[PDB]
Design a protein around this ligand. Structure first.
Ligand SMILES: CCCCCCCCCCCCCCCCCC(=O)OC[C@H](COP(=O)([O-])OCC(O)COP(=O)([O-])OC[C@@H](COC(=O)CCCCCCCCCCCCCCCCC)OC(=O)CCCCCCCCCCCCCCCCC)OC(=O)CCCCCCCCCCCCCCCCC
Ligand SMILES: CCCCCCCCCCCCCCCCCC(=O)OC[C@H](COP(=O)([O-])OCC(O)COP(=O)([O-])OC[C@@H](COC(=O)CCCCCCCCCCCCCCCCC)OC(=O)CCCCCCCCCCCCCCCCC)OC(=O)CCCCCCCCCCCCCCCCC
Ligand code: HEA
Ligand code: HEA
Ligand SMILES: CCCCCCCCCCCCCCCCCC(=O)OC[C@H](COP(=O)([O-])OCC[N+](C)(C)C)OC(=O)CCCCCCCCCCCCCCCCC
Ligand SMILES: CCCCCCCCCCCCCCCCCC(=O)OC[C@H](COP(=O)([O-])OCC[N+](C)(C)C)OC(=O)CCCCCCCCCCCCCCCCC
Ligand SMILES: CCCCCCCCCCCCCCCCCC(=O)OC[C@H](COP(=O)([O-])OCC[N+](C)(C)C)OC(=O)CCCCCCCCCCCCCCCCC
Ligand SMILES: CCCCCCCCCCCCCCCCCC(=O)OC[C@H](COP(=O)(O)OCCN)OC(=O)CCCCCCCCCCCCCCCCC
Ligand SMILES: [Cu+2]
Ligand SMILES: [Cu+2]
Ligand SMILES: [Cu+2]
Ligand SMILES: [Mg+2]
Lengths: 55, 51, 59, 495, 88, 151, 196, 161
């Protein structure tokens, strides 16, 4: 017998656990991709051509 | 021994594996948020008093 | 901690440097126990330092 | 007794039986491990105390440099590969596929005795002779060719040692692949051979593809030293040497690690009384790690001056290699679940230590993959922490699992579990005290290969002192346990 | 090793019995896989002394007139051997 | 174990064992026979375990020496060679481990002490005085020893 | 507390992001392993059939990938941010790594006795907020100019002229090292930079 | 009669298990001696005689084992090992080529001479040509090796058919 074929041993995920895991993973990915690639304020530039100095 | 708790595949997956992963996901999100606040000091504004 | 440039005979110095003994440019920022950190290094918890860091436009 | 003596010598020199060659590899590996440990203790005693307390002169730091280089070479090329691949590879590979011998029985003996020749040359060159090689285990020119402390012939003898070890490894690899491909018993397909055989096959494929390049690099060094060419001189390309050496360098690392994965998987099947979770997944991940290790060699040269595009590319490739190892770690964690592993077994606890330490070392090494962040961590103690919390806590503990699982089988005497518990736990705690501080001493700027350090770094070396004492205790416990293993009782009375 | 076979102490005035024998012991270490320990308490025997003790327990507890057995020093204890079942 | 030569000669193709009366060892270089004894890996262990015995007995001097050589042999050979070639390194190690060597230590001074917590941080360190000289075992520090000048 | 440069700040922030990610992963796995071990040691939750789960395996292979592309992108951008300031300079300095001492514009710098291992008799001076180009190489063997607190660590290889761009914002003395085995006096070959 | 075993090659004890390692040891210590004292310890021709003599063992055992112990499983093992060895040789050649073309693919270079056009009549094609390379003689050698390859392939096919 091939006892690990698709038709055998399917365990559905409870809806509550499915929702909780989905929310957790989506939140984590969104938060990380945001705070890493979007909230990057050290890349600051100032546009002021009058701050040049030539003797 | 005679006291060992033996579960079938379905029972084990349903009553052990899935709740474990659920708790792990909760820990993941909570730790991400609390660690980011712990270091930078702000939840969404990067370093505190610097920007 | 400060760099002792007055104890070194015949040391080249820039013409446009401040030679006052207690100038800012003679401080030793790292590699010495200080009790007053002037540099933010990769091992410094700003939380342990209460985030008393300078602004972004300054520095 | 002349006949008996000559018969024993012929038994252990003319042999081609895989079991005998395996035990010989194991013996040589353990001996070289102990020697490397002694040299490591010398290095640690040099670091712990202040004021060049052992060499006593700045001019004589060449002794310390020789210590570090021979420590590295001994522990890499004569401790792990002979044990991980030579010992269990020869002893088990024919048995696990149901066959008598390896293919090419004579080349197996040739491999072992090439290893012994290399060890002999190395030991004579670096002990009985004066002013030995002192250029770190990565023999970077022009330091290893155009220097003042490296002029003797024994340096060239050490390079030839590297050559013989390469020859031995190539022979062993070819033999393992060939035996595993054609001698399988009827009804066993190539991808149904157990996990250890597959990992050995991929390791052998790794060794075959890279060793000739290392041979080319070493021949370049020898030619520069002897016939006075200029391949690696001020008008040469020391970076070319680095490229070749490190093209060999990382495949060697994965060659070291993978057989430990195979052995741990096999032993787990034997002690948890359950099959491997996702065996096909683990085998595919092993081959993936093997293949991806051939495209990442230059993550060891981020500060040499590589092109910016190449820096980015090699950071990318290192992350790619990081993925499948994570898959394997998760597979292990799930394998142990639902099983009935023995609750009081040094094999079980050594497996736990292996898993934890490998995860931590993999993370720390994944930090180093980023080219930019490798600016601040190249040639500090962070790299030392990394490759010692992988080599000396994941490879060593995997071999401890194998050692405590296969001693009863080979010898037929059970294991003194309390003794082994003391040994393994003190090795764990002592080693962590030695290497963990290194990490935070690397982020603080302490360079490596220095016998004398600035006063800012005292606390890390104090914790290292503590760890070194615990390590001495653990290794003495281990050796005395083994001596007690093969010795009959010493006390007996009437109660 | 060769010591005495297990015996039975029996105290007369108190009328109380109990088995006994010589227990070898050694410092603990690794065992051997291919060896099941032989009979060490009763050397060179098929281990019948357990059966003899079990059979003789009812005889001894019921009250035995063991005046025909040797004593142990100057005490009130006598030795009964367990070579053969005791009936009296 | 015991030779199987009688069976080999009375076997089925005895001509194959004519070489066995030349200068030739039976176990290593003779054609194996259907009824040969089974040879084990570690014959000493194989013969001792079923009798309950560990292969080596410490009470026998020969066995004690053999086991010492097996376990501690090359280790002590390497140590002896190293000590013969580098007498000064072990001399210095002995000096340091016995408190005979002090780099620049003085009398009555206090020195910084910190266990962990990253690099030297003045808010965590202590200062320690030498208990040896607090008791009285030390009054002056030896100067005849080698000194790492220019450091 | 100032940062001493912008490149060091960027590297530090990238480091902090990776640290947060790895700590989160470690905490998740620690909770999982705690549950598993607590169940195991008490002889609970046994199932010899549980040796395969297609969905779980696919998901646990996918998840590390998505969280890794972000790290890779951030690292690449940090590299290029390190390397943009080239070409906007007005001062050039050349550095030679000799055998256990440094040379700046043909002026030698060796360790001194006033400081134990950190201080030097002749520092290297650069002006604050002024972009400078360092042309680094070596005469005898390979050294490594290492000032990791300013985000500079470049090997001085014989016959190979490396070219890095250095910029200072905080005035003071930065201590650095050789960060590459070069001989006996490797541990005593320090670097001193003064931003004034 | 004779009791038949499995199809694998059982394995024989042989002196080649240590002679080849001793030969390598001898070669390397001989080279060390020649490097140190600038004079050979023993005559090079005697050394080569020893090396040749030790290695005549392989053909003898080859003949006597093909006469007795050979089947298709053994033949396949041998052929696969040959393939792996040829792969190793190809890799060695690739490595040496790497060590050769390294400083030729990086076209810009520092040269003692001038290689800019319009200063002399033979300077533009200076850096771009290494004239002393024995061109048409190398061509003749290539023709010889092509002869050998094609002849051998033709004869191999002819005998196989
Ligand atoms: C990629 C997805 C492609 C498919 C997209 C899609 O919409 O497919 C729908 C389509 C519909 O099929 P279906 O939902 O099976 O429908 C049948 C029933 O109606 C419904 O049957 P079902 O819903 O039971 O079948 C699917 C079942 C499948 O069940 C599961 O997948 C269970 C959850 C497994 C998570 C494994 C985490 C591993 C981490 C390590 C843990 C320690 C070891 O549940 C889910 O798919 C829902 C969960 C989705 C993933 C959530 C991930 C949470 C991770 C939390 C842990 C965080 C760890 C942090 C540390 C490590 C960081 C790297 O296909 C799928 O859903 C299967 C996709 C398989 C891939
Ligand atoms: C100097 C040191 C030399 C190496 C160590 C020698 C130890 C023995 C010394 C002694 O007096 O033995 C008397 C003793 C007399 O035996 P017996 O007790 O009267 O019993 C009679 C028969 O042996 C019947 O007894 P059996 O057949 O049952 O054997 C007893 C059993 C007893 O063994 C045991 O119970 C334990 C054996 C462990 C084997 C490894 C297993 C896997 C790892 C397990 C963990 C332990 C690691 C090692 C220990 C460190 C632990 C921290 O096995 C052995 O004693 C030999 C096992 C293999 C280990 C020794 C291999 C030596 C030849 C290969 C040399 C190259 C490699 C080493 C470096 C050189 O000799 C032996 O038992 C060994 C046989 C002869 C070996 C020599 C063969 C010729 C080798 C020529 C090349 C030499 C090296 C290159 C030199 C180049 C020029 C400079
Ligand atoms: C597998 C390789 C391996 C192993 C096992 C070790 C083991 C140890 N190593 Fe090292 N090490 C290297 C590989 C290894 N090392 C390399 C490649 C370098 C770099 C060389 C260079 O930089 O050029 C290096 C450099 C290095 C340094 C560099 C110092 C300097 O550069 O500044 C230091 C100092 O702290 C050190 C310490 C130790 C210690 C204290 C141990 C051990 O004491 C801790 C663990 C000890 C064990 C107990 C293992 C001993 C094994 C046996 C006990 C055999 C018994 C049998 C088995 C269990 C199978 N190692
Ligand atoms: C001994 C075995 C071994 C192993 C397995 C590794 C694995 C890795 N190593 Fe390393 N390494 C060495 C041995 C090893 N290494 C040695 C000896 C040196 C020093 C040579 C010397 O300089 O002398 C060295 C040096 C070294 C450097 C040198 C840094 C420097 O010198 O500049 C770098 C940097 O790129 C590096 C990176 C890696 C990476 C990225 C992995 C990755 O394979 C790690 C992957 C592991 C995992 C990732 C764990 C699984 C993680 C999870 C469970 C999920 C998390 C996953 C994601 C979020 C994606 N290693
Ligand atoms: C750092 C880099 C190091 C160097 C790397 C480069 C490679 C180094 C050398 C690797 C050798 C690998 C050999 C692979 C297998 C070769 C074929 C093989 O084994 O065939 C089966 C057999 C060996 O196996 P066997 O003898 O056990 O045979 C088993 C039985 N039969 C034959 C039925 C299969 O080979 C031969 O019969 C001939 C092999 C001869 C090899 C050596 C001869 C010359 C020695 C050197 C002479 C002087 C040189 C100067
Ligand atoms: C509530 C009590 C907390 C734990 C008590 C012990 C730690 C004391 C306070 C810790 C913070 C201040 C650091 C000073 C001391 C740190 C000691 C240490 O291990 O440092 C390494 C490391 C060094 O890292 P660290 O201290 O730099 O941590 C980072 C700190 N900041 C936030 C400032 C950046 O210390 C730690 O990891 C801290 C926790 C240590 C707890 C150890 C418990 C396990 C014990 C294992 C065996 C150790 C044997 C030691 C025996 C000593 C006595 C006999
Ligand atoms: C005869 C031997 C067997 C066959 C050999 C020919 C086929 C080989 C195919 C496989 C690749 C071989 C290894 C790489 C070769 C290139 C060397 C190298 O890495 O250079 C580094 C150089 C870069 O180094 P660099 O230019 O920074 O350094 C030069 C040295 N200094 C610094 C001193 C100036 O090139 C590259 O990295 C580019 C990528 C690889 C390009 C491959 C070129 C070879 C293609 C040949 C095709 C035509 C062949 C037939 C005619
Ligand atoms: C599978 C086996 C092959 C793997 C090839 C992987 C290729 C990765 C990228 C190659 C590359 O270019 O890497 C960059 C590195 C150095 O780059 P750099 O010299 O700074 O840039 C050019 C400067 N003018 O470039 C180099 O160092 C040159 C590398 C050349 C390719 C060598 C590949 C190995 C050949 C031998 C083994 C082949 C079979 C295994
Ligand atoms: Cu690598
Ligand atoms: Cu240097
Ligand atoms: Cu240096
Ligand atoms: Mg370096």
């Amino acid at each position: 017998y091939f006892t690990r074929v698709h038709k055998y041993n399917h365990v559905p995920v409870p809806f509550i656990l499915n929702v909780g895991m989905s929310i957790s993973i989506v939140t984590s990915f969104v938060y990380f991709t945001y705070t890493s690639l979007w909230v990057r304020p050290e890349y600051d530039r100032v546009v002021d051509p009058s701050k040049a100095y030539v003797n | 021994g005679g006291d060992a708790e033996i579960l079938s595949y379905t029972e084990y997956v349903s009553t052990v594996v899935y709740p474990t992963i659920f708790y792990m996901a909760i820990t993941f999100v909570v730790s991400l948020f609390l660690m980011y606040y712990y270091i930078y000091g702000t939840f969404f504004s990067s370093t505190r008093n610097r920007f | 901690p400060r760099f002792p440039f007055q104890e070194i005979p015949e040391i080249y110095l820039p013409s446009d440097i401040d030679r006052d003994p207690n100038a800012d440019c003679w401080r030793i920022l790292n590699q010495v126990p200080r009790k007053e950190k002037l540099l933010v290094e990769i091992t410094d918890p700003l939380r342990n330092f209460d985030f008393k860091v300078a602004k972004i436009k300054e520095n | 007794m002349i006949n008996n003596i000559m018969h024993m010598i012929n038994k252990y020199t003319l042999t081609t039986s895989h079991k005998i060659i395996g035990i010989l590899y194991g013996y040589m590996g353990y001996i070289a491990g102990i020697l490397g440990y002694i040299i490591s203790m010398l290095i640690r005693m040099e670091l712990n105390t202040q004021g060049l307390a052992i060499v006593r002169k700045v001019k004589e730091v060449t002794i310390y440099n020789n210590w570090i280089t021979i420590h590295g070479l001994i522990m890499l090329f004569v401790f792990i590969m002979p044990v991980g691949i030579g010992f269990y590879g020869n002893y088990l590979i024919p048995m696990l596929i149901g066959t008598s011998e390896l293919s090419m029985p004579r080349m197996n003996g040739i491999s072992f005795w090439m290893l012994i020749v290399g060890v002999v040359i190395f030991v004579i060159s670096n002990v009985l002779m004066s002013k030995p090689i002192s250029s770190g285990w990565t023999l970077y020119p022009p330091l290893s060719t155009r220097d003042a402390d490296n002029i003797g012939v024994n340096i060239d003898l050490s390079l030839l040692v590297v050559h013989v070890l390469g020859i031995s490894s190539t022979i062993g690899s070819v033999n393992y692949i060939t035996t595993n491909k054609y001698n399988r018993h009827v009804g066993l397909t190539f991808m149904n051979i157990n996990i250890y055989n597959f990992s050995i096959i991929v390791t052998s494929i790794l060794l075959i593809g890279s060793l000739p390049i290392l041979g080319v690099a070493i021949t370049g060094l020898l030619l520069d030293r002897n016939i006075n060419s200029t391949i690696y001189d001020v008008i040469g390309d020391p970076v070319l040497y680095q490229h070749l050496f490190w093209f060999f360098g990382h495949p060697e690392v994965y060659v070291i690690i993978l057989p430990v994965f195979g052995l741990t998987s096999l032993i787990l099947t034997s002690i948890i009384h359950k099959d491997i979770f996702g065996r096909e997944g683990m085998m595919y991940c092993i081959i993936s790690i093997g293949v991806v290790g051939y495209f990442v060699w230059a993550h060891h040269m981020f500060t040499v001056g590589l092109d910016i595009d190449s820096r980015s590319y090699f950071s990318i490739a290192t992350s790619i290699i990081s993925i499948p190892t994570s898959v394997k770690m998760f597979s292990y964690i799930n394998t142990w679940a639902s099983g009935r592993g023995f609750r009081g077994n040094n094999s079980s606890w050594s497996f736990f230590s292996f898993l934890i330490c490998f995860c931590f070392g993999g993370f720390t090494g994944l930090l180093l993959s980023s080219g930019s962040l490798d600016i601040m961590l190249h040639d500090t103690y962070f790299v030392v922490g990394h490759f010692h919390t992988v080599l000396s806590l994941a490879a060593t503990f995997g071999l401890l699992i194998a050692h405590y699982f296969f001693l009863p089988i080979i010898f037929s005497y059970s294991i003194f579990e309390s003794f082994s518990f003391y040994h393994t736990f003190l090795l764990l705690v002592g080693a962590l005290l030695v290497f963990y501080p290194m990490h935070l001493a690397g982020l603080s700027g302490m360079a490596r290969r220095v016998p004398e350090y600035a006063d800012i770094f005292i606390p890390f070396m104090t914790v290292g002192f503590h760890g070194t004492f615990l390590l001495i205790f653990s290794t003495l416990t281990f050796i005395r346990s083994y001596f007690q293993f093969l010795s009959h009782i010493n006390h007996s009375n009437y109660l | 090793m060769n010591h005495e076979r297990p015996w039975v102490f029996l105290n007369k005035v108190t009328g109380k019995w109990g088995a006994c024998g010589w227990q070898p012991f050694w410092k603990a270490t690794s065992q051997s896989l291919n060896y099941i320990p032989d009979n060490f308490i009763a050397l060179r025997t098929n281990g019948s002394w357990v059966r003899n003790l079990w059979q003789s327990s009812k005889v001894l507890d019921r009250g035995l007139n063991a005046s025909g057995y040797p004593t142990v020093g100057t005490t009130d204890w006598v030795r009964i051997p367990l070579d053969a079942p005791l009936e009296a | 174990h015991g030779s199987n030569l009688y069976n080999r000669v009375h076997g089925n193709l005895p001509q194959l064992y004519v070489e066995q009366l030349y200068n030739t060892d039976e176990i290593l270089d003779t054609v194996p026979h259907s009824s040969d004894p089974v040879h084990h890996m570690f014959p000493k262990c194989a013969a001792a375990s079923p009798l309950g015995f560990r292969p080596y007995d410490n009470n026998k001097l020969w066995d004690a020496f053999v086991l010492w050589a097996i376990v501690y042999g090359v280790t002590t050979i390497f140590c002896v060679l190293h000590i013969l070639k580098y007498p000064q390194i072990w001399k210095h190690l002995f000096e340091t481990l016995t408190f005979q060597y002090t780099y620049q230590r003085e009398i009555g001074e206090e020195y910084v002490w910190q266990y962990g917590g990253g690099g030297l941080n003045p808010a965590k360190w202590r200062f320690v005085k030498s208990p040896l000289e607090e008791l009285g075992l030390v009054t002056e520090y030896r100067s005849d020893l080698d000194y790492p000048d220019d450091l | 507390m100032r940062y001493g440069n912008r490149e060091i700040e960027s590297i530090i922030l990238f480091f902090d992001q990776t640290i947060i990610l790895y700590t989160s992963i470690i905490n998740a796995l620690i909770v999982g392993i705690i549950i598993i071990i607590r169940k195991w040691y008490n002889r609970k939750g046994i199932c010899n059939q549980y040796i395969y789960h297609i969905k779980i395996e696919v998901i646990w292979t996918i998840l590390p990938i998505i969280f890794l592309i972000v790290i890779v992108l951030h690292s690449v951008t940090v590299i290029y941010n390190l390397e943009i300031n080239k070409g906007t300079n007005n001062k050039y300095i050349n550095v030679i790594g000799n055998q256990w001492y440094w040379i700046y514009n043909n002026i030698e710098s060796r360790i001194s006795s006033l400081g134990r291992i950190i201080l030097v008799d002749q520092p290297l001076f650069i002006k604050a907020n002024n972009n400078t180009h360092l042309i680094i190489s070596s005469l005898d063997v390979i050294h490594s100019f290492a000032l990791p607190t300013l985000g500079i660590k470049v090997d001085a290889i014989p016959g190979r002229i490396n070219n890095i761009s250095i910029n200072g914002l905080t005035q003071g003395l930065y201590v650095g090292y050789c960060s590459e085995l070069c001989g006996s006096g490797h541990a005593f070959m320090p670097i001193n930079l003064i931003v004034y | 009669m004779i009791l038949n075993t499995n199809i694998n090659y059982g394995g024989r004890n042989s002196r080649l298990c240590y002679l080849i390692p001793l030969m390598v040891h001898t070669i390397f210590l001989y080279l060390a001696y020649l490097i140190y004292y600038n004079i050979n310890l023993i005559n090079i021709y005697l050394l080569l005689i020893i090396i040749i003599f030790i290695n005549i063992e392989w053909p003898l055992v080859i003949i006597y084992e093909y006469i007795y112990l050979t089947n298709y499983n053994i033949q396949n093992n041998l052929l696969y090992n040959i393939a792996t060895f040829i792969f190793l040789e190809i890799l060695l050649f690739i490595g040496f080529y790497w060590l050769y073309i390294n400083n030729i693919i990086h076209y810009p270079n520092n040269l003692p001479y001038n290689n800019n056009i319009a200063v002399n009549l033979l300077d533009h094609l200076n850096h771009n040509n290494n004239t002393d390379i024995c061109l048409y003689i190398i061509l003749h050698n290539l023709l010889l090796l092509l002869y050998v390859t094609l002849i051998l392939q033709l004869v191999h096919r002819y005998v196989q058919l």
